[PDB]
Structure formats: C-alpha cells, structure tokens
Amino acid sequence: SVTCPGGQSTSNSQCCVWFDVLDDLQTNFYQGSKCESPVRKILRIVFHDAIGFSPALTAAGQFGGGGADGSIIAHSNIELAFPANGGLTDTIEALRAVGINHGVSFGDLIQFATAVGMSNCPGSPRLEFLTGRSNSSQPSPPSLIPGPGNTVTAILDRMGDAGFSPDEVVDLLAAHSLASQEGLNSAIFRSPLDSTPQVFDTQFYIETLLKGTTQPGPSLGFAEELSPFPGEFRMRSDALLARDSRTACRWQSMTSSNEVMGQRYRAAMAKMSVLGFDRNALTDCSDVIPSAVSNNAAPVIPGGLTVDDIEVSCPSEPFPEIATASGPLPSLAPAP
Ligand code: HEM
Numbered sequence: 001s002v003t004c005p006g007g008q009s010t011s012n013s014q015c016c017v018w019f020d021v022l023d024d025l026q027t028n029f030y031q032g033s034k035c036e037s038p039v040r041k042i043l044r045i046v047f048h049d050a051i052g053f054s055p056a057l058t059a060a061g062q063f064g065g066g067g068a069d070g071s072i073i074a075h076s077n078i079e080l081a082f083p084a085n086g087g088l089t090d091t092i093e094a095l096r097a098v099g100i101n102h103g104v105s106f107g108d109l110i111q112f113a114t115a116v117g118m119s120n121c122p123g124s125p126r127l128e129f130l131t132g133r134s135n136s137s138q139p140s141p142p143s144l145i146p147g148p149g150n151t152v153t154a155i156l157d158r159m160g161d162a163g164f165s166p167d168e169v170v171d172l173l174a175a176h177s178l179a180s181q182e183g184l185n186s187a188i189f190r191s192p193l194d195s196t197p198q199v200f201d202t203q204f205y206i207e208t209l210l211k212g213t214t215q216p217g218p219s220l221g222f223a224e225e226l227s228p229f230p231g232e233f234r235m236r237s238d239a240l241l242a243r244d245s246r247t248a249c250r251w252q253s254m255t256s257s258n259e260v261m262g263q264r265y266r267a268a269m270a271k272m273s274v275l276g277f278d279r280n281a282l283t284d285c286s287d288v289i290p291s292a293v294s295n296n297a298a299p300v301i302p303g304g305l306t307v308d309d310i311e312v313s314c315p316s317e318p319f320p321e322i323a324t325a326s327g328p329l330p331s332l333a334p335a336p
C-alpha cells in the first residue's frame with residue numbers, strides 16, 4: 001500500500017531504497033540485466049559471506065562468525081586471503097561502491113544482488129529478499145568455507161555445523177547450474193560446470209553423474225576430476241557428492257524436475273540468507289525482485305550419451321526417464 005517516489009507499489013517503505021539499488025545493479029553490475037560472470041561471482045560471495053558462521057566455535061568459547069553480515073566486504077582485507085575467496089576482489093569492490101552510494105548494509109546488499117542476479121537467469125525461482133541486517137560485522141574466522149578437495153564427510157560436517165542437512169547441501173549446489181571455474185585450472189578459463197551455465201536447470205545434476213571420460217585441459221588443476229565432454233570442468237567435491245550414499249538420492253531426485261529443484265534451492269537460500277540473524281526482525285521486500293524469464297527447455301542427457309553412461313548412485317530409486325540427444329559429444333564454450 002506503500003507507493004514509493006518511483007511509483008512502484010510495495011509492502012513497506014523500507015523497500016523503496018531497493019528500487020534504486022535494483023536499477024543501478026541491472027544497468028551497471030549486471031551490464032543490462034544479463035546472466036554472466038557477475039551473477040556467478042555474486043553467488044560465490046553470498047555463500048562465502050553466510051557460511052562464516054560456526055556454532056561449534058561459539059560452543060568452544062570463540063567468535064564463530066556473524067553469518068550473512070557483509071563481513072566479506074567490510075573485512076575483505078582479511079577474508080579475501082582465504083583459500084576459497086580468490087577471484088572475488090573485483091566483484092567485492094563493485095559491491096562496496098554500490099552499498100556506500102545507496103546507503104544499504106553490505107549484508108543486505110549481497111543478498112539483494114543474489115536475488116536480482118538470479119532473476120536474470122532463465123529458469124530461476126524468485127528468491128526471497130529481506131532487509132534490515134545490521135551493517136556491523138567482525139571478520140569471519142578462517143577455515144569455514146568448504147573446499148573442492150575436501151571429503152564428503154568434511155563438507156557435510158562443516159555445512160552441518162552452519163545449520164544445513166545433507167539434503168540442503170545438495171539443494172544449495174543447484175547454484176553450480178550457473179557456474180564455471182577460473183582459479184582451479186588456468187588453461188581453461190571459465191570452463192562451465194554444466195552445459196547450460198546461463199540457464200538455472202537440472203543439467204548440473206545430470207552431467208556430474210555421467211562417467212568421467214574427458215580431460216578438458218592439457219593438465220589438471222586443483223581438485224579437478226575427469227569430465228564427460230570437452231569444455232566441461234568437474235571438481236572433485238561435486239563428483240563425490242553425486243556418488244556418496246549420503247547425498248546421492250537427493251542428487252538423483254534433482255535431475256528430472258526444474259520446478260522441484262527451484263523450490264528446494266529457494267528454501268535453502270532463504271535459510272542461508274539469515275545465518276546470524278532473526279528473519280522475524282527483518283522486513284520482507286521480496287516484491288522488489290521480479291520473476292525471471294521462464295526456461296522452456298527439457299532436461300537432457302547431452303551428446304548421444306545414454307542412461308548407461310550415468311553412474312546411478314541412489315541404490316533404491318530408478319534413474320528418471322530423461323531425454324537423450326544426438327551425438328557427437330558437445331564441446332562447451334567458456335561461460336560468458
Ligand atoms: C558445497 C560445497 C561447495 C564447494 C566445495 C564449491 C566449490 C567451488 C569452486 C572450487 C568453484 C570454482 C571457483 C573458481 O575457480 O573460479 C566454484 C564455483 C562456483 N560456485 Fe561453488 N562450491 C560449493 C557450493 C556452492 C554454493 C552453496 C554456492 C552458492 C549458492 C556456490 C556457487 C558457485 C558458483 C555460482 C560458481 C561459479 C563461479 C564462476 O562461474 O565464476 N557453490 N564452487
């Protein structure tokens with residue numbers, strides 16, 4: 001019932017500043033509302049901001065981190081020295097400037113930019129957006145971000161401490177549907193993790209289950225595993241999680257339904273967004289976030305591979321009936 005100066009109708013006056021932030025991010029940060037490297041960097045950032053949260057450290061008399069507190073920006077000098085935070089400073093600086101110019105908290109801005117960026121990627125669900133997180137933060141403790149060479153046990157333990165069940169770890173990894181690497185293997189910059197790095201779809205879950213046959217680069221980078229076709233990169237953590245008895249049935253259940261995947265991801269991102277916070281103390285400004293263009297494409301097994309090339313890892317459920325395609329194997333272009 002609130003009408004912002006802009007003539008947008010919104011639920012609360014605390015949302016009105018976010019319409020200006022929307023316009024700025026879509027023109028500038030997102031280079032005309034695109035789904036390219038900025039959104040992908042922002043998703044690494046939202047994860048690495050929020051996951052600096054450790055009830056186990058708190059329980060052991062230590063600061064455990066403030067979660068989705070914008071610490072990765074406010075204390076970037078410290079946090080961008082962590083192993084998992086390479087290749088982010090240029091994006092962090094862009095966000096810093098936007099937060100200061102519009103006078104919004106860094107923790108809220110990261111969450112907003114996440115929801116806005118997702119909205120530019122076909123097939124995305126509409127992420128919740130809450131405002132009101134204090135701009136105050138202390139540096140995250142070190143060693144809280146899962147790495148691609150970690151065992152499934154280590155990943156589930158860390159994620160579990162933060163608050164996520166194994167199913168939720170799988171659900172959050174839907175973000176690897178919009179993904180590449182730059183820092184693991186320098187010879188294949190922006191090699192995608194799935195065949196559709198600009199579509200928020202189930203391809204990631206399907207393609208990580210295919211037999212690893214292909215070395216996309218002239219050598220291996222850090223935590224790199226064989227992939228199913230030229231141009232695609234596979235990190236060891238994703239390979240293991242796809243196959244591990246603790247995560248494989250949820251991973252398999254993602255393969256055939258973009259709609260269930262999106263719901264699960266939205267729910268898990270909502271939980272992650274308020275690590276360190278009481279969501280009931282925040283204001284819901286989700287109406288600022290528009291819907292994404294719909295994705296009309298069907299799940300597929302690419303390249304004339306079939307279910308026989310799938311390493312079915314959920315021992316109690318048959319692999320879903322997924323369409324196949326013509327060969328030859330594709331060669332993925334670098335993600336834009
Ligand atoms: C569960 C453990 C996870 C591990 C070990 C992991 C590991 C990584 C690594 C090593 C990269 C490559 C970065 C580079 O070299 O450029 C990557 C990329 C990416 N990750 Fe994750 N990740 C995980 C979870 C997540 C989550 C929860 C999200 C966000 C919801 C996320 C979003 C992304 C995105 C979007 C990219 C692509 C970045 C790009 O294209 O520039 N990841 N991940």
Ligand SMILES: *[C@@H]1O[C@H](CO)[C@@H](O[C@@H]2O[C@H](CO)[C@@H](O)[C@H](O)[C@H]2NC(C)=O)[C@H](O)[C@H]1NC(C)=O
Binds near residue numbers: 074136
């Ligand atoms: C959020 O807190 C940060 C850190 O104190 C503030 O960032 C500083 O902002 C000043 C004034 O604009 C800049 O001159 C500094 O470069 C910023 N420092 C860092 C580390 O980013 C920020 O202004 C605060 N935001 C709000 C809305 O109060």
Ligand SMILES: *[C@H]1O[C@H](CO)[C@@H](O)[C@H](O)[C@@H]1O
Binds near residue numbers: 231332333
């Ligand atoms: C096949 O072709 C793509 C480019 O079209 C590459 O990105 C890949 O590395 C392979 O050469």
Ligand SMILES: [C-]#N
Binds near residue numbers: 047084
């Ligand atoms: C991904 N970090």
Ligand SMILES: [Ca+2]
Binds near residue numbers: 049065066
């Ligand atoms: Ca943080």
Ligand SMILES: [Ca+2]
Binds near residue numbers: 178198199201202
């Ligand atoms: Ca995809």
